C-alpha cells in the first residue's frame, strides 16, 4: 500500500520541470499519433473546420526511472503538471479546447524504463484556406499542422509512432460533414524556418470534396428551367403583345429572385465563383429573349391575328441551341 | 553536466526581483520587437474591426541573467515567464485578445549567454479599425495596430522595430476573402504628453476591396433592368396593357434588387456609393413608367409619336452620362 506512495514521492526529488530530458546532451525525440473521434463540421464562412482528437505522445526521459513491484504508473493530473512535457501546439488552430469535464482529460503513464506515454482529448478549430473559384464543384485539402513552439529542430524532433499512413486513425463515425465527403487523409512531416530558428512540423491533410446534389435541385434546375420558360415564348403568336411582354418581364423577375437566393448560400467572397457565371449567363439569356421580342414587335404592321416573323423562326432554334451549347462547355470544364 | 545547467538556472533566478526593470536606475532598457503574422480574418465593416493571429516577439537585454561556460542558448519551459521581468506591452486598439493555450500556453523564453532574453507569444487580437465607407465598395481601408507600453515612459523603456523594415513578416502570404493587402508600414515614434514621451510602435496595412463580386451581383442586374425599362419606348402608346405591365414590373424588380441586396450587404446606416447607384437606377425606371403616363394622357386626355421618339435617345444618353459621372468620381 504505502510502497506505491513512496515510489511517487522519490520521482520528483531533484527532478526539474524547466529542462527537457537530455538537455545539452542529445535530441529529445517525441513519437506521436492521433486518433480522430469525429471530423467536425467544416464552415465555409469562417473557412475553418472543427475536429476532435485523442492526441497521443511518447518520449523517453531518463530522470524518471524507477524499480518496484509495479511496472507502469498512472499519475494524478496534479503530478502530471510537475513533469516536463512537450509544448506541442497547432500551427493553424484558431481556437482549441482541452476538455476537462468532469476531470482533466489527460493521462500520463510512466514505465520503469522511463518511456512516458501521454494522451489527451482535444477539440481543434484548425483554419483551412479555400479556393472557391469552382464552387460548388471544388475539392479542398484542409490541413492540420502541429509542432513544438519553444524548442527548435536541434532540441525536439517529432516522429510518427508507426508508418505515417497508419499513424492517424479515423473512426468510421468520424465524418460529421453535411456538404463535404472525407475521401482520405495524407500524413507527412516537414521542416519550417522562422524568425527564431528551424522547427519540425508534422502535417496531416484531410481531403474534402463538396457534394453537388443540393445545388442542382436548388439552383441549377430552376435556372435551367426558367431560361427554357422564357425561350418558350417564341412559339406565341407575334400579335399577343400584352402576353409576351408580361411573359418576358416576369421571367426576368423570376431569375432575379433565383440569383439572389443562390448567392445567399454561397459564402461572402469577391472573386467570380463558377456558379455566379452560370447564373449570369442565365440572366443574359432571359434578358436577351425579351429584347428579341422588342425587335419583332417593331415590324408587326397589323395588331390582329400575318405569318410567323423570320426572327421568331430563327430565335426558336438559335436560343435553345446556344444555351444547350453553353451547358456542355460549362459542365465539361468543371467536371473533368 | 546536466545538473550543472540546473545549477546555472538556479543561480540566475535566485535573488532575481520581478519588480525591477533591467538597469533600474540607469539608461532605458531598449526593447526590440518583430511580429510574425499568421492569418487575418473577420474584417467586419459592421463593427469596424479585424482579427489577426501573430507570433508576437520581444527582444531585450538583461545583464542580471547572463551565464558563462555554456555555449548554447537555453530554452526554458514557458512556465518560467512568471519568474522573470517582461515589458508591460499592450495593444492600444484591441477589443478582445488572448494567448492560445492548447496544448500548453503558447510562449517561449530563451536566454542567451550575454543575458539577452527573447519572449515570444502567440496572440490573437480583435483590433478595432475605423472605416470610411462613403466610397464602398470602391473603398481603400487603412487598418492599424497600435503598440504601447502601459506604465513606463521613454525615460525608462524604448521600443524599436528589430530588423528594420523586415521586422514584420508573413504579410504577403495572407489571403483575405474580399480584400487585397497592398502594403504595410512600420512607425516608430514617441507620443508626447505633459509628463513625458510614451514610446509607441504602429503596424498599419492598406486594405483594398475587390469589385468582382458586386459587378455580377449589383451593377449588372441594375443595368440590365434599366435597359429593359427602355423597351417601353419602342411599343405603341396604344398598348396600354403591355407598356404599363412592362414598366411597373421593372420598378418592382428594382425594388426587389435593392431590398435583397440591403440584407446581403452589411448594415452600415449612412449613405454609400452603392446606394447612390441603386437609387440612381431606381429613378430611371420610375421616370420611364412616368414617361408613358404623359404620353397616354396627351394622346387621349388632350387628344404624338415625338415624345416617345425623343425619349428613345434621351434615356439611353442620360443613363450613359450618369454612369460616366459616377465611375469617374468614384474611381
Amino acid at each position: 500500500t504505502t510502497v506505491f506512495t513512496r515510489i511517487l514521492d522519490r520521482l520528483l526529488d531533484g527532478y526539474d520541470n524547466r529542462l527537457r530530458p537530455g538537455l545539452g546532451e542529445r535530441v529529445t525525440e517525441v513519437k506521436t499519433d492521433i486518433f480522430v473521434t469525429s471530423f467536425g463540421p467544416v464552415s465555409d464562412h469562417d473557412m475553418e473546420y472543427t475536429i476532435d482528437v485523442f492526441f497521443r505522445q511518447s518520449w523517453k526521459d531518463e530522470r524518471l526511472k524507477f524499480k518496484g513491484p509495479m511496472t507502469v504508473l498512472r499519475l494524478n493530473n496534479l503530478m502530471a503538471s510537475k513533469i516536463w512535457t512537450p509544448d506541442t501546439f497547432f500551427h493553424n488552430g484558431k481556437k482549441s479546447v482541452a476538455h476537462n469535464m468532469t476531470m482533466p482529460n489527460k493521462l500520463l503513464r510512466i514505465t520503469e524504463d522511463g518511456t512516458l506515454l501521454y494522451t489527451m482529448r482535444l477539440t481543434v478549430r484548425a483554419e483551412c484556406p479555400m479556393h472557391l473559384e469552382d464552387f460548388p464543384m471544388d475539392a479542398h485539402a484542409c490541413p492540420l499542422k502541429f509542432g513544438s513552439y519553444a524548442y527548435t529542430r536541434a532540441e525536439v524532433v517529432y516522429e510518427w509512432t508507426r508508418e505515417p499512413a497508419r499513424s492517424v486513425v479515423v473512426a468510421e463515425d468520424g465524418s460529421r460533414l453535411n456538404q463535404y465527403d472525407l475521401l482520405g487523409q495524407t500524413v507527412d512531416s516537414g521542416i519550417v524556418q522562422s524568425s527564431t530558428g528551424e522547427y519540425v512540423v508534422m502535417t496531416t491533410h484531410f481531403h474534402l470534396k463538396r457534394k453537388i446534389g443540393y445545388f442542382v435541385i436548388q439552383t441549377y434546375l430552376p435556372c435551367i428551367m426558367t431560361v427554357i420558360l422564357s425561350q418558350v415564348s417564341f412559339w406565341l403568336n407575334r400579335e399577343s403583345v400584352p402576353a409576351r411582354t408580361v411573359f418576358g418581364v416576369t421571367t426576368v423577375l423570376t431569375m432575379t429572385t433565383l440569383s439572389i437566393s443562390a448567392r445567399n448560400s454561397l459564402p461572402k467572397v469577391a472573386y467570380a465563383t463558377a456558379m455566379d457565371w452560370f447564373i449570369a449567363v442565365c440572366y443574359a439569356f432571359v434578358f436577351s429573349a425579351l429584347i428579341e421580342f422588342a425587335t419583332v414587335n417593331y415590324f408587326t404592321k397589323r395588331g390582329y391575328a400575318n405569318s410567323v416573323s423570320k426572327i421568331d423562326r430563327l430565335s426558336r432554334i438559335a436560343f435553345p441551341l446556344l444555351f444547350g451549347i453553353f451547358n456542355l462547355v460549362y459542365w465539361a470544364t468543371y467536371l473533368n | 553536466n546536466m545538473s550543472f545547467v540546473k545549477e546555472t538556472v538556479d543561480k540566475l533566478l535566485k535573488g532575481y526581483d520581478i519588480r525591477l526593470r533591467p538597469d533600474f536606475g540607469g539608461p532605458p532598457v531598449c526593447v526590440g520587437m518583430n511580429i510574425d503574422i499568421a492569418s487575418i480574418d473577420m474584417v467586419s465593416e459592421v463593427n469596424m474591426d479585424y482579427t489577426l493571429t501573430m507570433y508576437f516577439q520581444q527582444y531585450w537585454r538583461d545583464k542580471r541573467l547572463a551565464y558563462s561556460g555554456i555555449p548554447l542558448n537555453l530554452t526554458l519551459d514557458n512556465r518560467v515567464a512568471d519568474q522573470l521581468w517582461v515589458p508591460d506591452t499592450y495593444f492600444l486598439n484591441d477589443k478582445k485578445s488572448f494567448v492560445h493555450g492548447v496544448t500548453v500556453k503558447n510562449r517561449m523564453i530563451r536566454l542567451h549567454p550575454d543575458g539577452t532574453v527573447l519572449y515570444g507569444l502567440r496572440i490573437t487580437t480583435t483590433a478595432a479599425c475605423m472605416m470610411d465607407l462613403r466610397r464602398y465598395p470602391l473603398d481603400e481601408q487603412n487598418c492599424t495596430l497600435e503598440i504601447e507600453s502601459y506604465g513606463y515612459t521613454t525615460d525608462d523603456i524604448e521600443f524599436y522595430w528589430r530588423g528594420g523594415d523586415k521586422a514584420v513578416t508573413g504579410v504577403e502570404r495572407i489571403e483575405l476573402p474580399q480584400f487585397s493587402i497592398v502594403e504595410h508600414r512600420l512607425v516608430s515614434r514617441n507620443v508626447v504628453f505633459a509628463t513625458g514621451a510614451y514610446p509607441r510602435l504602429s503596424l498599419s496595412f492598406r486594405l483594398k476591396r475587390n469589385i468582382g463580386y458586386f459587378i455580377l451581383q449589383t451593377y449588372m442586374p441594375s443595368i440590365l433592368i434599366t435597359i429593359l425599362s427602355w423597351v417601353s419606348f419602342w411599343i405603341n402608346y396604344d398598348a396600354s396593357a403591355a407598356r404599363v405591365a412592362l414598366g411597373i414590373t421593372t420598378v418592382l424588380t428594382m425594388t426587389t434588387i435593392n431590398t435583397h441586396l440591403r440584407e446581403t450587404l452589411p448594415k452600415i446606416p449612412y449613405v454609400k456609393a452603392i446606394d447612390m447607384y441603386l437609387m440612381g437606377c431606381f429613378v430611371f425606371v420610375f421616370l420611364a413608367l412616368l414617361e408613358y403616363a404623359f404620353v397616354n394622357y396627351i394622346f387621349f386626355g388632350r387628344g404624338v409619336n415625338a415624345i416617345d421618339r425623343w425619349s428613345r435617345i434621351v434615356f439611353p444618353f442620360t443613363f450613359s452620362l450618369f454612369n460616366l459621372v459616377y465611375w469617374l468620381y468614384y474611381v
Partner: nanobody
Amino acid sequence: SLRVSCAASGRTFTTYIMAWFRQAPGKEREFLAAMDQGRIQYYGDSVRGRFTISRDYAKNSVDLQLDGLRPEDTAVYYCAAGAGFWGLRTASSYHYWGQGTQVTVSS
C-alpha cells in the same frame, strides 16, 4: 552549387503549393521538394539534406537550390504548382506544370 528558380506568371499562387519535380530519362517522375502557404518545406528522402527550396511569395516564384551534385542527378527538372489533392507528393495532384529545364552533371 546550382540555384534554379521558377517564376510564375498569369496566376497568383499565394495559397498554392509551388513544388518541384525531377524526371529522369525514361525511368520515372520523382518528388523533390514543396512549400505550401505556411512555409512548410518538404523534401524527398532520396536527396534529403542536399536540395534547398525557397519561395518569394512577393514575386510568386519558387527557387530550388542544388547542392552536392552527383552524376545521377542529370535529369530534366520540372516546377509544378497545385493544391496537392490526394497528397502533395503525387504528380497528378498539381494542375499547372512548368516547361522544365535540363541540367547536365559530369564528374
